[PDB]
Amino acid sequence: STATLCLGHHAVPNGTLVKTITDDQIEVTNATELVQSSSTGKICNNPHRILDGIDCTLIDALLGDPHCDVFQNETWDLFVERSKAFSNCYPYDVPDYASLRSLVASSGTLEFITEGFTWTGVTQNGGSNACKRGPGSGFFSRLNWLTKSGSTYPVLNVTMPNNDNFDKLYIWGIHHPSTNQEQTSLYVQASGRVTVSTRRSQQTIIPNIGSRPWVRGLSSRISIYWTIVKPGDVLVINSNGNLIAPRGYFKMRTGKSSIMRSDAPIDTCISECITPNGSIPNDKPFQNVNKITYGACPKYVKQNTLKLATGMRNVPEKQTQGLFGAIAGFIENGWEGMIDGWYGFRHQNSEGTGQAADLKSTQAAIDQINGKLNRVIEKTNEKFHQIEKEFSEVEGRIQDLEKYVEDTKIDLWSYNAELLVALENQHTIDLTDSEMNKLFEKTRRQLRENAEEMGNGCFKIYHKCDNACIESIRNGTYDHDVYRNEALNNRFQI
Amino acid sequence: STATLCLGHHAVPNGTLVKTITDDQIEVTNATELVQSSSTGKICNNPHRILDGIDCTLIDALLGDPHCDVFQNETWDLFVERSKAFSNCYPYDVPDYASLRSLVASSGTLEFITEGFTWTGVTQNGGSNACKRGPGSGFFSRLNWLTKSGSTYPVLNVTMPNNDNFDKLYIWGIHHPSTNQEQTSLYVQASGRVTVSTRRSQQTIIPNIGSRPWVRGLSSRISIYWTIVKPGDVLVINSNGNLIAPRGYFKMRTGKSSIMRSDAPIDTCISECITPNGSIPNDKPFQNVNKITYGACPKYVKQNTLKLATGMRNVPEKQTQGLFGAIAGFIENGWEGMIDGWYGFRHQNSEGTGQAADLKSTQAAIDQINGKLNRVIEKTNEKFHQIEKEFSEVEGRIQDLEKYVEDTKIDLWSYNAELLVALENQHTIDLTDSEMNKLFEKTRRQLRENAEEMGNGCFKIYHKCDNACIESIRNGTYDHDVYRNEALNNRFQI
């Protein structure tokens, strides 16, 4: 007399839990991770030029420490400073080291151009055993130590014009004697002085005499300062003692260059994202590996996981199992048997019982889901030279702000990630339920007065509906007028 | 025997594409831009007091450079520093220039109050040809150059009590001789010294001697320093040479004042938002003109566009055209013919065929949409003195942080904008579909057992329904019992 046609949605045996706007742990038939939590441990030397510092820091490579001149005129996309690095040359100090380290790092080059300063009344090339270069004493390859010639130290007053169309970064210094005795014996005057200026900037450092800790055989020091000279501008160096003169300039640039402190072994491979932990794939939108990055990278978040639903809910409402073949619809059950689709049909008629998935709805759900997927991982976000976020020394005010800006950022992005994943998951679940409900309605209208909703997601079709008939319903060509009469009779009184 | 009544929604010929949670390019019947991408090129001198610096910087106007004293006692809401600006006076330098430039800018005033310092043992008014004021040599109108009287320079020790109920900003300085010869001939002592203090703060600067680049006929310089004196507090100035004494104080304030570097021509007009590019209308929530702003402004984002749907989807599912007059509902088609509403009806009956839009639903959709519109552009956000985001010089650490804070902000707001627009557009589309579906249901219940859903968004009304009848359905007064019998007969067997 009649037939049965249930509408349904697939379900899987082993599903996944995800967060939403109302349920923290709600099961879906699938999910993709959004937080990269692991690194390979090795820094890929492609596609960014990785200049491993090894035993050198950027500053030592800059200054010309004897064990670092292998980096002379080096360039890099990312300079990697090793923790084992050490300095073996004249014990010096760089006031505002961080800034110098930062500005050179970003320049991405130690391209030094010797200029030819004529120092009359002293004659260059001082050297120390602390900076043993080769067989005997040496000094920073880029700095020029000037002492006394004969028995005097004429007031040095030289200039160097920047006729070039680029910024010149002059690195110079001043010597801090251990004793007034050392001061005099080297620079004659009781107390020397150094003043490096351009038309717009000036700096006059006074050598301070005193006994520091013994480092590499000395109690005296060298303070490092720098001076950038713009095009047209000129550089004047005046001094009456203690001048650790520059030998030229370092050509300055701007680019994607930066510097990273890491102990990760550099390796031959490709990876756009670099963290001190090693390279990390930037396929996912967020990462929990490190907040220090370089290259196209996933945003750092505090979360070690954020699963994005890429499927509908699993076996409706949820939990375990039961029932059997009487044919039930999409109400409180999904079909673990439908692997050939997401949504579909199951009929029980004259010819028996079977199932056929509806690719239309299956595709739409799948499509919309890939639509949000691409959107969620469509961005890249390249970040190169940024701020430091780990610090060796207590500094106070500037560090607190540097630490506060990042935490502030990290927290804002974690929330962004948490909310996005929830909104997206809520949407995906509604979107999938919607596709299902849509199919049921589409079939509901096709059947007209020839069938009744059995409340279980199935329609009781009040007329002989063999497989060919069941098919027509599935492929939208079901002509209801054809069976209207029989159904109207079977329905309204048997 | 019967009649037909379809439910529908309008559609337009030329529609717009917008982003959503699943589709990046989905067409709607309308959209409003959210990102202001263009500026007029001129800065409106209303409603903010625009003080054009012209050939002056704030610092030169402060100090009293001869070509800037036209700004004496000036006030402003926004000081606009021109790129052509130049200094024509004593070659000086302001350590922490930026801060002085910032703190004066925010004070918004150069209201100078001469105090009457008695300098015994020297006698004021030094002047230089580099600072040619009028016919002969001059000097910063606000600074007082003190040299030597007779043949000595008594240790200057004066004080100035802040009995006023406001902060006094004292701008003073120190002279840096080119040669010890110049030092002595001006201040007698081999080396002078300057110390400006209050009960809580102190600063002792030592004049450093040396040859700088020749600027305006000199190799010597003047360093500028400042001292703010709180109420009750007092200012003591001690020196034994090189003192470029202050002439009084600048009254300090707090307000909405700031300073902007721009080359935009100032123009007579009204506009709350100012960018270096020129004023921009702040009617939209975001802007892509510049991250440097002043006044009620749209938040800066990296996006040059963000369209906000202000209409439903266009001609259902989408693309091109076809079919004709057989009367179809809101299913896969919208009505380009319904310009008198958003939703409505179309019937085919005894008297012929026609259309009538339903203002109820039309208004609701329109209302909700304007509701979100107002919300989206209800805020103002006035921001006045902020941080600098463009820098002429390489500085390192502080610049990296200043650059990092803004990028961090800019990226967070771009995401905010991107997500908001998507959520809003997803909502608007659901909201509109909902209004439509609601109408169909309302009509569905009105018709009771007298009609059947033809699956195309139309109802086949199984009874004679002339236009007057069609009207009653449209205006909720359709009494179904009246035609129940005829419909029940026509339906359940003809």
Next chain:
Amino acid sequence: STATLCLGHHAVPNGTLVKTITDDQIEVTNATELVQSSSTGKICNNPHRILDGIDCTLIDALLGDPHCDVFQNETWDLFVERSKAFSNCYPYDVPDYASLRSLVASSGTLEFITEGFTWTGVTQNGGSNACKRGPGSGFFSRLNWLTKSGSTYPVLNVTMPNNDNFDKLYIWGIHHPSTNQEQTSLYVQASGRVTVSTRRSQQTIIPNIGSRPWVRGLSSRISIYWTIVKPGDVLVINSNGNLIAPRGYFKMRTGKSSIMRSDAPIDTCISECITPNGSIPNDKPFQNVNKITYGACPKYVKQNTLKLATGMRNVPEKQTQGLFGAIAGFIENGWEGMIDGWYGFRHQNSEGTGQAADLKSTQAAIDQINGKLNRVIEKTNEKFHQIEKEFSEVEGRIQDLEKYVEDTKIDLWSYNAELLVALENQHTIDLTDSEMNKLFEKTRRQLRENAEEMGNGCFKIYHKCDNACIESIRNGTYDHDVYRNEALNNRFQI
């Protein structure tokens, strides 16, 4: 012949207004506040160790001002600096005071360990009447004033090795004479000098002579500087005059410690969150009390209120009253009579009329709502030492950035709060309407061809349905085949 069964949802007399994606003021049956707007006015000394500074600042407690030595070796989780605090000891100044104040505050301890410096050629314990300790002159308990012995001041050159496995924070200083006369009479040399170094850092301060304002009977000052010495590292102090020597070191730590400027009375109570205004309950996600906080606290936002809907909409569409007992469903009216549930039924049949709420839907709505509630207030967010956000002095550049970072944050979180509340409220309203609509559908399917939707949210059940029958429908056991015939007859022609 028939019966009536309406589906409905409760409503309350006095409801609340909340924001959503389309309506700013839409009424719901309930809402929970999200913004903590009030503080008790007292700081709870539990669970954070509150060290009230009273008349002392951290720096004075550090240095050893006579009226502060009650804080010797103090520890704290939060040091509270009182506005009444004052200094009564040698008039000094701390260059970069803020940083010292910050780094000690975070250390959370003033655990001083005297080291035993041998000062040969001078002999310690200088004292002043400005720092009257007890009966006569005294000095900072942690600083050691060294003058001249006999008639000379030997070049002090001592060292102190950090053999300890922790950072040592040495606080030292230099004396600034009022007159060269005072300089000589105390330190012999025309001009002394101080240089404190470690193997990696150095600082050489030169005593600057001059007359400052008279403070506590003096015109001379003491500048404070500090030096942190790492493990293995060593500290060398060299000087030829003006050395205000340290007496040992302060053991350095890292932790949750911080410092807060407040005038709130400390009180015995428990509260994780501290604001200068006094403790505040951190049960709510956001707070509008102050942007300065310590402990697990609600995020600061500019909003003084953000209500989170914790109930469905009130009496449908909205406004006032009317109608009566004819029995209407959930369409444009809610039932103020249903206090025993959120959703439910009302029937009119043979036995009369009554109401019975449906706990199934009632529970689901309630559940989902508590689900989002917990999520909304599931986080804690502990923040300890952060940046300062209120400043006593004009500083410029660093303050602008510090001010800009916070405003930037505050604005981003206000938006986050505004959007979250709207999304959540939109969700809650849909979620509740959905539960209602779901119930109606569930009943719709149960009734099959035995009833018709009266369009008012009620079903006209075309068959004798006494209370026992009405019950079966309510508890899902309604067998429709039983009354199918009678209904089919009553329906399709009476």
